[PDB]
Design an enzyme around this catalytic site. Structure first.
Site, PDB file in Angstrom:
ATOM      1  N   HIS B  43      -2.556  -3.987   7.565  1.00  0.00           N
ATOM      2  CA  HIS B  43      -3.876  -3.389   7.422  1.00  0.00           C
ATOM      3  C   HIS B  43      -4.975  -4.382   7.799  1.00  0.00           C
ATOM      4  O   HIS B  43      -6.123  -3.996   7.997  1.00  0.00           O
ATOM      5  CB  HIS B  43      -4.068  -2.808   6.020  1.00  0.00           C
ATOM      6  N   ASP B  96       3.246  -2.553   4.747  1.00  0.00           N
ATOM      7  CA  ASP B  96       2.007  -3.212   5.114  1.00  0.00           C
ATOM      8  C   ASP B  96       2.326  -4.654   5.538  1.00  0.00           C
ATOM      9  O   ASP B  96       2.134  -5.581   4.755  1.00  0.00           O
ATOM     10  CB  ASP B  96       0.982  -3.078   3.978  1.00  0.00           C
ATOM     11  N   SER B 202      -6.499 -10.242   0.983  1.00  0.00           N
ATOM     12  CA  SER B 202      -5.414  -9.420   1.488  1.00  0.00           C
ATOM     13  C   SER B 202      -4.793 -10.025   2.758  1.00  0.00           C
ATOM     14  O   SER B 202      -5.433 -10.744   3.518  1.00  0.00           O
ATOM     15  CB  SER B 202      -5.881  -8.026   1.699  1.00  0.00           C
TER      16      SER B 202
END
Ligand SMILES: *[C@@H]1O[C@H](CO)[C@@H](O)[C@H](O)[C@H]1NC(C)=O
Ligand code: NA
Lengths: 40, 256, 64
Positions: B43, B96, B202
């Site tokens: 992502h 992911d 992230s």
């Protein structure tokens, strides 16, 4: 070797060993906490 | 990192920052797994809801950073982006995971050094509820602010240690569908302690140290959260071991 | 990604009802004062990504 070194490069054999910690037999400020979690 | 501490120098030598070229800004964390390959979340690269789909000309990675730390940090261009083919951003970021290949192999240093990826034994030994791993990144020190984001941004790499949480507890904490490609970590409310990944962390690593061989392993990639460090909520992370076959495929492909 | 609180009605991919993301295929009706928020079926706009950390020292021009 889980990866072929030819496409992965150097680094797999010596991975996860920090030059400023493990390589010197020195512990970082909080890793003891991690091991306590396994034991207690 | 919410409720973490300044990392010691050389704590996380596999730590990578993914950086947009123009404007210059931090996009995500990432990790170094060899002299040539960097692991991050899908992502970070591809995210239709934000109209995000980076090409290699859009990005730099920065390695060996503690805070431009010259003669200590390496900036590298990217040769290639690889996103897990079955990455499902439509639902809630199943699979992911992404690999970035560096334009050129880098030298290792006191501050630059690859993490290990887990194998079967590693996952079986280390992944148990209550065992603590470690998250690191340059993201927000708090979910919200009064005046400006600037106020929650750290000057040095932050670290936090957080326990793996039982699957049933992870599933009970959210209405999002959790898959076998995810796990959650964090303290329950009224445990003595707090902490979480937050915005800008992230794609960064969740590592655990093996007692058996004294080596660090990336069990996780920071993937998603409902808020940061909210009571009764948990950070969710890509299960690296479960996706290792795809990692192997990409790296072992001829002319990768 | 971090889902944070919806900041205007019509948004999705943000926290609408308490600490729960209001997902794609839905949109968030912001409660006024004393009203709860509601995540309803409907087309929503993703809450935009917050201005990233763009505060670093300039790197060599060579890396462009
Ligand atoms: C991702 O961008 C590349 C252009 O390099 C394209 O091949 C691919 O189809 C794109 N996917 C989306 C969702 O835009
Ligand atoms: Na929490």
């Amino acid at each position: 070797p889980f990866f072929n070194e030819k496409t992965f490069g150097a680094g797999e054999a010596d991975c996860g060993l920090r030059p400023l910690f493990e390589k010197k037999q020195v512990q970082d400020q909080t890793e003891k906490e991690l091991f306590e979690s396994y034991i207690e | 990192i919410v409720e973490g501490q300044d990392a010691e120098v050389g704590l996380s030598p596999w730590q990578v920052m993914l950086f947009r070229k123009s404007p210059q800004e931090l996009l995500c964390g990432a990790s170094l797994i060899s002299d040539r390959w960097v692991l991050t979340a899908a992502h970070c690269l591809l995210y239709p809801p934000w109209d995000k789909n980076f090409t290699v000309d859009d990005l730099l990675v920065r390695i060996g950073k503690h805070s431009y730390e010259r003669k200590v940090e390496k900036i590298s261009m990217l040769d290639k982006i690889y996103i897990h083919p079955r990455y499902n951003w439509k639902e809630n970021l199943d699979r992911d995971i992404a690999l970035l290949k560096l334009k050129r192999p880098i030298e290792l240093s006191d501050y630059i050094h690859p993490v290990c990826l887990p194998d079967k034994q590693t996952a079986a030994k280390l992944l148990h509820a209550g065992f603590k791993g470690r998250v690191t990144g340059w993201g927000n020190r708090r979910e919200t602010w009064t005046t400006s984001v600037a106020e929650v941004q750290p000057s040095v790499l932050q670290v936090v240690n957080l326990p793996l949480v039982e699957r049933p507890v992870c599933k009970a904490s959210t209405r999002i569908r959790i898959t076998d490609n995810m796990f959650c970590a964090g303290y329950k409310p009224g445990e003595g302690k707090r902490g979480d990944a937050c915005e800008g962390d992230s794609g960064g690593p969740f590592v655990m140290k093996s007692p058996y061989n004294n080596r660090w392993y990336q069990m996780g990639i920071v993937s998603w959260g409902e808020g940061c460090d909210r009571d009764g909520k948990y950070g969710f992370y890509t299960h690296v071991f479960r996706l290792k076959k795809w990692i192997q495929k990409v790296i072992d492909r001829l002319g990768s | 990604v971090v889902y944070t609180d919806x900041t205007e009605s019509g948004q999705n991919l943000x926290l609408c009802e308490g600490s729960n993301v209001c997902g794609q295929g839905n949109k968030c009706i912001l409660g006024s004062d004393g009203e709860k928020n509601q995540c309803v079926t409907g087309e929503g706009t993703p809450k935009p990504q917050s201005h990233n950390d763009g505060d670093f020292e300039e790197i060599p021009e060579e890396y462009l």
